[PDB]
Amino acid sequence: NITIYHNPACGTSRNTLEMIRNSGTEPTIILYLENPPSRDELVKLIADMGISVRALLAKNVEPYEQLGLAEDKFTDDQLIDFMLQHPILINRPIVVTPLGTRLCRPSEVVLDILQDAQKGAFTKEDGEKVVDEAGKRL
Ligand SMILES: [Cs+]
Ligand SMILES: [Cs+]
Ligand SMILES: [Cs+]
Ligand SMILES: [Cs+]
Ligand SMILES: [Cs+]
């Protein structure tokens, strides 16, 4: 039982999703821009990902720029509430499996939490080889 918080317009998210599939399971796909996590759920995700609230913020998106979030003037809960109100601020993708939750940047981080091994070689969109046919990480 796997969930991905996916943005189809993001290569890292696309690569991650295909690596999930290459492990033999079709995840539940949450288009977080339209269906963001509830506050409780977002707090849980951050906790399980073991990163700071700020480390989850997507830079170079309009609200990050306009709300001045680069500046160290925001408590964690201020940042959580901005992410809820402006889901494009949630960096991508977040993946949940029975083993754990990760912000999969770079995409191959997802290999940590996938239970089943890649079923064969995996090469990212741009041609970057990730695992060979034998299953070794390159
Ligand atoms: Cs929700
Ligand atoms: Cs806008
Ligand atoms: Cs693993
Ligand atoms: Cs393999
Ligand atoms: Cs790339």
Swiss-Prot record:
Claim: Oxidoreductase is one of the keywords in the record: yes
EC class: oxidoreductase
Effect the entry attributes to changing residue 125 to D: 13-fold decrease in catalytic efficiency with arsenate. Mutant is sensitive at high arsenate concentrations
InterPro entries in the cross-refs: Arsenate_reductase, Arsenate_reductase-like, Thioredoxin-like_sf
Chemical reaction(s) catalysed: [glutaredoxin]-dithiol + arsenate + glutathione + H(+) = glutathionyl-S-S-[glutaredoxin] + arsenite + H2O
Documented effect of changing residue 128 to A: 3-fold decrease in catalytic efficiency with arsenate. Mutant is relatively resistant to arsenate, but is more sensitive at higher concentrations
Pfam families: ArsC
Effect of residue 104 to V: Mutant retains arsenate resistance
Effect on the protein upon substituting residue 126 to A: 4-fold decrease in catalytic efficiency with arsenate. Mutant is relatively resistant to arsenate, but is more sensitive at higher concentrations
Enzyme Commission (EC) number: 1.20.4.1
Keywords attached to this entry: Arsenical resistance, Oxidoreductase, Plasmid
Superkingdom of origin organism: Bacteria
Regulation: Inhibited by the thiol reagents iodoacetate (IAA) and N-ethylmaleimide (NEM). Activity is rapidly inactivated by the histidine-modifying reagent diethylpyrocarbonate (DEPC).
Effect the entry attributes to changing residue 125 to K: 17-fold decrease in catalytic efficiency with arsenate. Mutant is sensitive at high arsenate concentrations
Activity vs pH: Optimum pH is 6.3-6.8.
Record-annotated site: Important for activity. Lowers pKa of the active site Cys: 6
Result when mutating residue 6 to P/G/R: Loss of reductase activity. Mutant is sensitive to arsenate
GO molecular function: arsenate reductase (glutaredoxin) activity
GO biological process terms, semicolon-separated: response to arsenic-containing substance
Active site per UniProt: 10
Annotated site, Important for activity. Involved in arsenate binding and transition-state stabilization, chain positions: 58, 92, 105
Free-text function comment from the UniProt entry: Involved in resistance to arsenate. Catalyzes the reduction of arsenate [As(V)] to arsenite [As(III)]. The resulting arsenite is then extruded from the cell via the ArsAB transport system.
Subunit structure, interactors included: Monomer in solution.
Recorded family membership: Belongs to the ArsC family.
Protein name according to UniProt: Arsenate reductase
Species assigned in the record: Escherichia coli
Gene symbol of the encoding locus: arsC
